[PDB]
């Protein structure tokens, strides 16, 4: 079963932390994918974006390893992207899924025009960059879907973005940089200070200092 | 660079007559048959997610 190795994992396993948002609010690093399984481990669906063979030339030939790019995320508010290189493809996919779980970020969603219903699109134009690949996400009116290439479309749909316009520049042919750039654009959604986030922050009791005795006696 | 062999392989391929098969549906019926094959029943699958024309 799950024997936590870290303080945050122990707190999560003991029902101490109510939601993943209490991890995100304090920018705590997640070092056990079992936390992601504990919180979203029923609505998470993965997707193997790519399997690519990388080769390193040696004395007697080329050592070939396989790199798996795997995107994960429940199609409501959360998404992650993991890359893992290994000798065996199945091992690479397992490692990529674990890394994708470890990298799951919250996706802030907003409205294009009026504010009826639940959010459907990104709150503003955001941009992610990865090694010459630039991905720009633009709010779109309700019902237009994702106007994008397949690779960013997968990550945007899996992040809960109902409809969105996109632009891309650079060598988007390299799927790894494309995926990392659109993931970066997605993860910048909650770091954009809009006037509705101007209200002064109210500091709450941090998870480590809130259940501090729960670990003192444990 | 001779031109003497111009219909070599096509000329020497053993002719096989086409079988007498039943006419296929056309139009709305064919689309209904495709929809039934692909979305309504899962009969031919083995759980391994192969292709429609897989010979293995």
């Amino acid at each position: 079963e799950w024997m936590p190795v870290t303080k945050l994992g122990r707190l999560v396993k003991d029902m101490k932390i109510k939601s993943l948002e209490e991890i995100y609010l304090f920018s705590l690093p997640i070092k056990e994918s079992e936390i992601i399984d504990f919180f979203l481990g029923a609505s998470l669906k993965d997707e193997v974006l790519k399997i690519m063979p990388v080769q390193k030339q040696t004395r007697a030939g080329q050592r070939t390893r396989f790199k798996a790019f795997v995107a994960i995320g429940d199609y409501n508010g959360h998404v992650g992207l993991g890359v893992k290189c290994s000798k065996e493809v199945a091992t690479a996919i397992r490692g990529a899924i674990i890394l994708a779980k470890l990298s799951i970020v919250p996706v802030r969603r907003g409205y294009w025009g009026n504010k009826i219903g639940k959010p459907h699109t990104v709150p503003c134009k955001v941009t992610g960059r990865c090694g010459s690949v630039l991905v720009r996400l633009i709010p779109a009116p309700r019902g237009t879907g994702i106007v994008s290439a397949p690779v960013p479309k997968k990550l945007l749909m899996m992040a809960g973005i109902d409809d969105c316009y996109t632009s891309a520049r650079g060598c988007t042919a390299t799927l790894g940089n494309f995926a990392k750039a659109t993931f970066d654009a997605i993860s910048k959604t909650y770091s954009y200070l809009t006037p509705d986030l101007w209200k002064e922050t109210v500091f709450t009791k941090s998870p480590y200092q809130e259940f501090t005795d729960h670990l003192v006696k444990t | 660079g001779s031109l003497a062999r111009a219909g070599k392989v096509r000329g020497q391929t053993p002719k096989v007559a086409k079988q007498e098969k039943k006419k296929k549906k056309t139009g709305r019926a064919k689309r209904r048959m495709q929809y039934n094959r692909r979305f309504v029943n899962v009969v031919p699958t083995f759980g391994k997610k192969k292709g429609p024309n897989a010979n293995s």
């Binding site: 193997v48 399997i51 396989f66 065996e88 493809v89 996919i93 | 292709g51 293995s56």
Partner: peptide, 30 residues
């Protein structure tokens, strides 16, 4: 026939595209 290692020892040969397509079909079949 197994796509998983078919891809592991055919990705450099004439059959790279077919085994890659089959492996992705196994992974996400829909």
């Amino acid at each position: 026939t197994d796509p998983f290692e078919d891809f592991e020892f055919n990705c450099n040969t004439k059959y790279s595209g077919g085994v890659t397509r089959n492996l992705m079909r196994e992974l996400n079949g829909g």
